[PDB]
């Protein structure tokens, strides 16, 4: 499968999540995603084909994971935006007030700005600390998906937020959305990964 940020993957033929970013670890290909999406050794599939298994994760506390993929997958330095692409150029962290977009299998590519850093989410499973908050909208299934600036700086992966009864927060004004992402920096160093860029 071609690995692009934002696309759908299923875990152990049940849950769906979105791919974060194509990365490598030595000769191993992989992608970073959300920790809540699967447990170590869960099987990830893209379009019905097996592409890899979860190598590691942290959830709750943090919300991160990386899947190592088989040799046959194609890693790409891109994030889906409809039928087009955002090229990944690095991982400089943007500050509060910067514009940012996120891509994921449920609401597609949505943009907005960062409103706060170091936010704690109280999930049913336990607190997730250190999250960055944006007001781009998102829905169930977007988790693990890419957060990136128009300029190509990867910011993190979708963790969660406040969804209404329709499964997303896109029908509530930007001023009321809380959309939370796990910063990418610490996931790259924690796992020794390198981002693929173009």
């Amino acid at each position: 499968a071609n690995i692009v940020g934002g696309i759908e993957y299923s875990i152990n033929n049940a849950s769906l999540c979105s791919v974060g970013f194509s990365v490598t670890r030595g000769a191993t290909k992989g992608f970073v995603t959300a920790g809540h999406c699967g447990t170590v050794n869960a099987t990830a599939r893209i379009g019905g084909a097996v592409v890899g298994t979860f190598a590691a994760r942290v959830f709750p506390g943090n919300d991160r994971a990386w899947v190592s993929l088989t040799s046959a997958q194609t890693l790409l330095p891109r994030v889906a935006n409809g039928s087009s692409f955002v090229t990944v150029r690095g991982s400089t962290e943007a500050a509060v007030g910067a514009a940012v977009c996120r891509s994921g299998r449920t609401t597609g590519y949505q943009c907005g700005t960062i409103t706060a850093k170091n936010v704690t989410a109280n999930y049913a499973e336990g607190a997730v600390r250190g999250l960055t908050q944006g007001n781009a909208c998102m829905g169930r299934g977007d988790s693990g998906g890419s957060w990136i600036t128009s300029a190509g700086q990867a910011q993190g992966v979708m963790s969660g937020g406040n969804v209404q009864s329709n499964g997303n927060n896109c029908g509530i004004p930007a001023s009321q959305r809380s959309s939370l992402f796990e910063r990418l920096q610490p996931i790259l160093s924690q796992y020794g990964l390198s981002l693929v860029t173009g």
Binding site: D63, Y123, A124, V128, S143, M158, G160, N162, V163, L180
Partner: peptide, 4 residues
Amino acid sequence: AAPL
């Protein structure tokens, strides 16, 4: 808040 919910994960996703």
